[PDB]
Design a binder for these strands. Structure first.
Ligand SMILES: Nc1ncnc2c1ncn2[C@@H]1O[C@H](COP(=O)(O)OP(=O)(O)O)[C@@H](O)[C@H]1O
Length: 535
RNA sequence: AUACGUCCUGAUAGUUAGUAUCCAUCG
RNA sequence: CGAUGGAUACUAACUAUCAGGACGUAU
């Protein structure tokens, strides 16, 4: 029942020296050793939470992946595991419930932002956290919540060891030139205080996992000039699916084809058209079934129509695909990574990739033999797309060339973090509710929304911007806060002048937390009057 | 005829700010 | 409603270089 991997046991013993990051292609099995390293330190986690024990947290950005990884860890381990997501509405939960939750479970898999929230209000500090692994660590750039969490390491002492981990295949998240990749990798390895390694030998990975991705049958059309009325791209899909049927006459019923899109409306219309064609019972199209996977809760009541509700729908649709009930798939932005099917040999790239990372991630989804990669390109843009593809190939070649070990001898880069020009409130020191400079906006989201209050758009009570000349004539901004009649007086009516508008708002709104803490609205854990709504 | 210097539309490559549009993820 | 990331476009400044337009110096 247990399925090992030869290179990964070597990877584990190499990584169990210091902080180490593994970078490999899709299908490598890098995620699998997460459970092995979790069980390697299971003894520490056994500590009771009477005075604060050791617990392991697994951060996953996407909501459909938390249950999948929870089932994966449950399959090989007997430890109690729960699932956490803001869909349940945990915004109105007091300290005692959280203490009960921590004492009950053993591993709490949860998205990043909820971890931001819990660390923001001091329900528990970074102390006594046994281990912590990111998801898609290549997102840790600029003001990503990953970096916001990592910033809390600066406030605490270095002697503490809340080990951090994060796994990614592509180390970029935007378009770039082959002369800035070294700068990007150096910056990323400096930010998270960890080295990056990659398997030197890629035997099986090149056999069927990564280096033998589906062959790119670049097919063009004339779309730049219901199937026959909309752009002929749908006709190209029909022709390529007829080619698929001609290839797989033996499997004339169905296969595991997956369609990637970038706009939800396109996916919805595409699924509707193919379901209509299949239900018609015509000779050309009679055995096609597709279902939704993407869209997410979006918003409870604010200008949306998808209404994907709870994760139960995603769980059941993925189960019905795994059992073969669902065989065609359309989605936009949740099945790029973390979706695994043991037998898949066809991926249709209906919409073009936008950067390097998307192209690498959405290409290795197929894992079976003779897999098919299909790209929709136009004739006029064919030259530009060909040169862009050559650039991507060169980027991959140089990236695998620089796969040599890169250490971090200069720890000064970690100290070189661009600290904000103003300090935030912190009434109880480093051991108390350390308010972050980036959580002032979260606090101001819901002015007096707690307790009986209007349901109108009180979130944005409007602010006045004032500009004046200065010594360098770059101008300074006077952000002013004028809240309506809903609460007692406020100290930060206007903030300190700032070079930028955003920093002006931050300086004019951060002192609200400091003022409100003294007057008694908040508490020891900065939870306002322990009631629903508001952070 | 060459070289150098001041300002600028054009070009090569990077940074910063504002603005406008679009997309995705999540609370 | 909000925090974000990405993409394009405009203005605008600095940064290392090329060219041309307005002027000056050495040969
Ligand atoms: N030995 C194995 N046992 C079970 N599943 C596997 C194995 N090897 C690969 N897989 C499947 O293939 C996928 C590859 O996962 P892994 O190599 O851990 O990282 P990634 O998912 O990033 O490629 C997994 O989602 C898993 O379901």
């Amino acid at each position: 029942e247990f399925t090992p991997r030869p290179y990964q046991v070597e990877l584990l013993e190499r990584a169990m020296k210091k902080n180490t990051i593994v970078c490999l292609g899709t299908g490598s099995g890098k995620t699998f050793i997460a459970v092995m390293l979790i069980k390697e330190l299971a003894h520490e986690i056994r500590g009771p939470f009477n005075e604060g024990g050791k617990r392991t947290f697994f951060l996953v950005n996407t909501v459909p992946l938390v249950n999948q990884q929870a089932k994966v860890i449950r399959k090989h381990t007997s430890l109690k595991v729960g699932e956490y997501v803001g869909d349940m509405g945990v915004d109105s939960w007091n300290k005692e419930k959280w203490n009960q939750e921590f004492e009950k479970h053993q591993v709490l898999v949860m998205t990043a932002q909820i971890f931001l929230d819990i660390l923001n209000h001091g329900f528990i500090s970074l102390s006594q956290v046994n281990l912590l692994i990111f998801d898609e660590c290549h997102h840790a750039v600029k003001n990503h919540p990953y970096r916001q969490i990592m910033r809390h390491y600066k406030n605490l002492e270095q002697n503490d060891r809340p080990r951090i981990l994060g796994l990614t295949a592509s180390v970029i998240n935007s378009k770039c030139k082959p002369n800035q990749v070294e700068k990007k990798i150096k910056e990323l390895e400096a930010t998270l205080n960890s080295r990056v390694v990659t398997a030197s030998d890629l035997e099986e990975v090149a056999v069927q996992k990564y280096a033998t991705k589906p062959k790119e049958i670049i097919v063009s059309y004339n779309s730049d000039r219901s199937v026959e009325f909309v752009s002929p791209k749908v006709k190209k899909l029909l022709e390529i699916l007829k080619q698929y049927f001609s290839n797989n006459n033996n499997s004339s019923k169905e296969l595991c084809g997956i369609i990637f899109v970038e706009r939800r409306y396109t996916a919805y219309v595409l699924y509707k058209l193919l379901n209509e064609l299949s239900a018609k019972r015509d000779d050309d199209f009679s055995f096609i079934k597709c279902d939704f996977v993407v869209g997410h809760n979006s918003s409870p009541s604010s200008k949306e129509k998808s209404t994907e509700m709870n994760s139960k729908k995603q769980k059941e649709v993925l189960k019905k695909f795994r059992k073969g009930e669902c065989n065609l798939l359309v989605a936009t932005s949740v099945v790029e990574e973390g979706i695994d099917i043991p037998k898949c040999n066809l991926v249709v790239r209906f919409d073009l990739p936008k950067n390097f990372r998307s192209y690498v991630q959405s290409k290795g989804r197929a894992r079976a033999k003779n897999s098919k990669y299909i790209i929709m390109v136009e004739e006029d843009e064919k030259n530009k797309f060909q040169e862009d593809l050559n650039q991507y190939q060169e980027i991959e070649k140089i990236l695998l060339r620089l796969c040599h070990n890169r250490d971090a001898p200069s720890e000064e880069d970690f100290d070189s973090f661009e600290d904000e020009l103003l300090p935030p409130y912190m009434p109880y020191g480093t051991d108390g509710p350390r308010v972050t400079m980036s959580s002032a906006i979260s606090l101001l989201h819901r002015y007096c929304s707690k307790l009986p209050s209007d349901r109108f758009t009180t979130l944005t009570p409007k602010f006045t911007y004032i500009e004046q000349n200065n010594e360098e004539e770059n101008k300074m901004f006077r952000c002013t806060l004028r809240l309506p009649i809903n609460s007692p007086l406020r100290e930060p009516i206007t903030g300190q002048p700032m070079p930028s508008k955003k920093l002006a708002k931050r300086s004019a709104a951060l002192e609200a937390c400091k003022k409100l803490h003294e007057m008694g609205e908040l508490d020891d854990h900065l939870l306002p009057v322990k009631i629903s709504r508001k952070n």
